[PDB]
Amino acid sequence: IEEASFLNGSDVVILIDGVEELYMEEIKADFEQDEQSIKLLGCQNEISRVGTTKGSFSLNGYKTDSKFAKLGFRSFEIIYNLSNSETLGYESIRLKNCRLKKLPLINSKAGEIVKIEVEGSFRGYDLLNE
Amino acid sequence: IEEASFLNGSDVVILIDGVEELYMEEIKADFEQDEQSIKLLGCQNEISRVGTTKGSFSLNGYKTDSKFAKLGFRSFEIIYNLSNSETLGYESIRLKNCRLKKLPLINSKAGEIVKIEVEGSFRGYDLLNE
Amino acid sequence: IEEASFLNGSDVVILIDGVEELYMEEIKADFEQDEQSIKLLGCQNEISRVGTTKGSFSLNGYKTDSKFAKLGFRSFEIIYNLSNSETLGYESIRLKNCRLKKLPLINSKAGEIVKIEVEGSFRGYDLLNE
Amino acid sequence: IEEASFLNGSDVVILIDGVEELYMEEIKADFEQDEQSIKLLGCQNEISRVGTTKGSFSLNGYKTDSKFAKLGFRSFEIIYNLSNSETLGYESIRLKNCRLKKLPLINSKAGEIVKIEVEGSFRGYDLLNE
Amino acid sequence: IEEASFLNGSDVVILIDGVEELYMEEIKADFEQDEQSIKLLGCQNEISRVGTTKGSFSLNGYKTDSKFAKLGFRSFEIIYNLSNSETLGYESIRLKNCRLKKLPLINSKAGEIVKIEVEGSFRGYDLLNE
Amino acid sequence: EITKTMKCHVVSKNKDEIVKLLETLETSLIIDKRVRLREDKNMYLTLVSVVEDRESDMFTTGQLTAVFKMIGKIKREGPTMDKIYGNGNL
Amino acid sequence: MRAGIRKALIDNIKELKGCYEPNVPNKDTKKPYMVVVQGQDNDHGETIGFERSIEVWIYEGRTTFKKLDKLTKQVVEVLDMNTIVDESENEAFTCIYKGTSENDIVVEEWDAIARGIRFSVIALEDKEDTTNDRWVEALSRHTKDLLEIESYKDNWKKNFIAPCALWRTTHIENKRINYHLIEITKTMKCHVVSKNKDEIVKLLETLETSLIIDKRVRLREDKNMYLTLVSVVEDRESDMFTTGQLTAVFKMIGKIKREGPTMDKIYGNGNL
Secondary structure, three states: OOOOOOOEHHHEEEEEOOEEEOOEEEEEEEEEEOOOOEOOOOOOEOEOOOOOEEEEEEEEEEOOOOHHHHHOOOOEEEEEEEOOOOOOOOEEEEEEEEEEOOOOOOOOOOOOOOEEEEEEEOOEEEOOOO | OOOOOOOEHHHEEEEEOOEEEOOEEEEEEEEEOOOOOEEEOOEEEEEOOOOOEEEEEEEEEEOOOOHHHHHOOOOEEEEEEEOOOOOOOOEEEEEEEEEEOEEEEEEEEOOOEOEEEEEEEEEEEEOOOO | OOEOOOOEHHHEEEEEOOEEEOOEEEEEEEEEEOOOOEOOOOOOEOEOOOOOEEEEEEEEEEOOOOHHHHHOOOOEEEEEEEOOOOOOOOEEEEEEEEEEOEEEEEEEEOOOEOEEEEEEEOOEEEOOOO | OOEOOOOEHHHEEEEEOOEEEOOEEEEEEEEEEOOOOEOOOOOOEOEOOOOOEEEEEEEEEEOOOOHHHHHOOOEEEEEEEEOOOOOOOOEEEEEEEEEEOOEEEEEEEOOOEOEEEEEEEOOEEEEEEO | OOOOOOOOHHHEEEEEOOEEEOOEEEEEEEEEEOOOOEOOOOOOOOEOOOOOEEEEEEEEEEOOOOHHHHHOOOOEEEEEEEOOOOOOOOEEEEEEEEEEOOEEEEEEOOOOEOEEEEEEEEEEEEOOOO | OEEEEEEEOOOOOOHHHHHHHHHHHHHHHHHOOEEEOOOOOOOEEEEEEEEEOOOOOOOOOOOEEEEEEEOEOOOOOOOOOOOOOOOOOO | OHHHHHHHHHHHOOOOOEEEOOOOOOOOOOOOEEEEEEEEEEEOHHHHOEEEEEEEEEEEOOOOHHHHHHHHHHHHHHHOOOEEEEOOOOEEEEOEEEEEOOOOEEEOOOOEEEEEEEEEEOOOOOOOOOOOOHHHHHHHHHHHHHHOOEEOOOOOOOOOOOOEEOOOEEEEEEEOOOOOEEEEEEEEEEOOEOOOHHHHHHHHHHHHHHHHHOOEEEOOOOOOOEEEEEEEEEOOOOOOOOOOOEEEEEEEEEEOOOOOOOOOOOOOOOOO
16 A cells, blocks of 8 residues: 655744744745636626735744744745655745734733744745745 | 435545646535626515626645645646445536635644645536536 | 424425435525614604515535536425424425525535535425415 | 522413414513714713614524414514512513514424524514513 | 632622612623724824723623513613622722613523523713722 | 433344344334324324444343433313403593 | 241241241241341441341241242242331331342251242331421422322331332532522432332322422422422432432522611711
């Protein structure tokens, strides 16, 4: 029964602004595009076009320093190396010009671990590997 | 008590752009219309008409490669073979000119398998078989 | 402690377009109205009116064929016979000019039965029996 | 520890249009009022007034007949007697000119009891007894 | 390890309209403000001001009489004595010119206690004690 | 509402006969989902769930477990408003 | 209790030649005769109290065991849950049939065949039949009025008259739902003993129906406080004596009874 493999999400290595980030727990990033649906004057099915794109991302993790609060709304890059180990074909993605949507100064409940949450937007991406 | 049969959802075979897709586990697709409700004087009940159609679809599965991120917003076909085993009458549907709403570049949590989610819109469909 | 009875929901027999439907699990149908709330110039109590009626309905069940996908948006009748067994007074309702809102072309998760969901709108009804 | 008594909700007797209703489970009814918030030109705190009222009500129960489907959008009264067995001081309320918002023609799942849900609006109420 | 104390919520004593209320379970109240955020023409962070205030309150409890339905939308006062037992420093608050948003005429379910819910708005307050 | 969990035994020397009898009993209960309470009718027993545990003891426990429920109405037969009168003033 | 059992056996059984204490009868005794051996007294919980064990050993002249079978049936019929009055102690009791000795023994030296029937008696130490649980008193009164059988409140009594029904309380929960209100919830189990099992079914059925339809019970005859039913459930398999069939959960809300002093006289004075 020939082999398959699932990419466990604990293989992710996130580099925020050139320095490796090692307390993150999950990362999300999508490349939205406005659909710009057009209803032609004679045809009875809608048509879509690519429109204009707009990146968005988000991260959660454990707080270990004031990296993000000190980062402000500066533009910064994010790399994302999802290594596969059954076969060594890591999938590497770069995000260009990421910008925090909201600076998470404080988020802390009394009896639990202090997790940091981040969300923002990135102008474009570069699929470095696959 | 003559035989009956339910179509188990693990018989799906999804072909995205002419190459079979192995890791998808859930697929949705609908062909929306616009209701176009109209009031008429002297007729209390509203009346509906077809309006203009609009396709939409969604997919979920395990990440095995960067096929979707590489695909971009290009137009691409989807074919969906739902085979039946008690009787061999597979129901085959083809989706025409599918187009991703957003590229799922990164979606990964530390402890879980890296799943991919996709959704978009398709101009029309061809019910190949039933 | 004289008798009473509940109409168990597994007594329904749903005829879609004159051919009996065997695999339906749930059916809903309502006859809305726009209220047309009127605030008179002297009276503090708001007053309602019938306004225009607007039917709506929904169905759930197991997928056995491509009946609904092939049906398209064509008008079709639905008849619904809710039989009572303690006493034989079946409640029969007919729906006129039903029209699917969206064709459920594909909806199928990997490890589960392939259920079909349908919703639409109907212009009027006939309470055939009661 | 002198006696006290809640009002158990199974003491309700609902008379819909002068004929007693046996199968209702829950009944709800409120008497709204548009707040009409007024921000005076010199005073900092807002001021509100009674505005115009509007009744709304809801019912749930087991389907025993097609009374509500027959009733249509007609105007009808509801009387609601909530007896206190431990003191005999029943609180009786009468709703005037109730009007169904929607006819619950069909609402039936396969494996369960066929319940009926009703909601609407009533022009005014009479507190018959308290 | 010197003593501390939490104010248990069963020490509440609610007096509505000058008569003590025995069956209330939960009471909520708060004094809103319209923020009136103004974006200055040269400075790069938003500035907020007090704006106009508005009160809102809510009550939950067991139905013991038709007090609230009798009360209507007439104005009335609420007083709230949250006593403390480790030290006797009760925190007393009075709400001025309360007004029900809706008469809870009927709220009953078949096999449950007949609870009453009330919400409204109060023009102002006055912190009698602390 | 009166709910009863009624368990059923099927004893026989031949075990395959026990299997056949339990199978047909389950099928009959499922198909005809309710049972006439009396030959007079006027009452019924709606099935809720029928389950067989074949391992269970033939005598002590019993194999088939069935849950039935039945709804009854209070039989209030109070007096009647046979005669109504009223008078007037100003 | 030896005197009561002996007197009952002699009076009701006529084939009996005598009923003796354990090591009384000599070899000149005329068979069949019976022997009343008294066993342990063991504590069996709150509902049963101390339970005594009795054995009525039958003896017969080794003609054939069928005579002994007939005599055993006679003894079981005579003593099984029939209230017996012991005139010596002037205290009654009610033996419960429990089984039979290990095997049917033959004793060659005595030239006899013996079998030991096994009885028991319930709640030896209980001598009041009263309860400070007002809820139990109220429900026992209600059951007696509805059902026309005895009701024994807190725990079994040794001279219970079948058919009957106990109304012990098995669990109590108190809550302060408000500043002024307190909730008291009791899970009260009910037994229904009777020789005829179909009578047990009928009594439990009518008791459940009455509890549902009349969903609340007068705590006292002042009508002030009622108990209000929450859920009544019958487990017919459960033991008739130790556990009890019917389980009913009752609740009741009470108000804190603070009658403080009154502002009879008020005064106020003015300044500027």
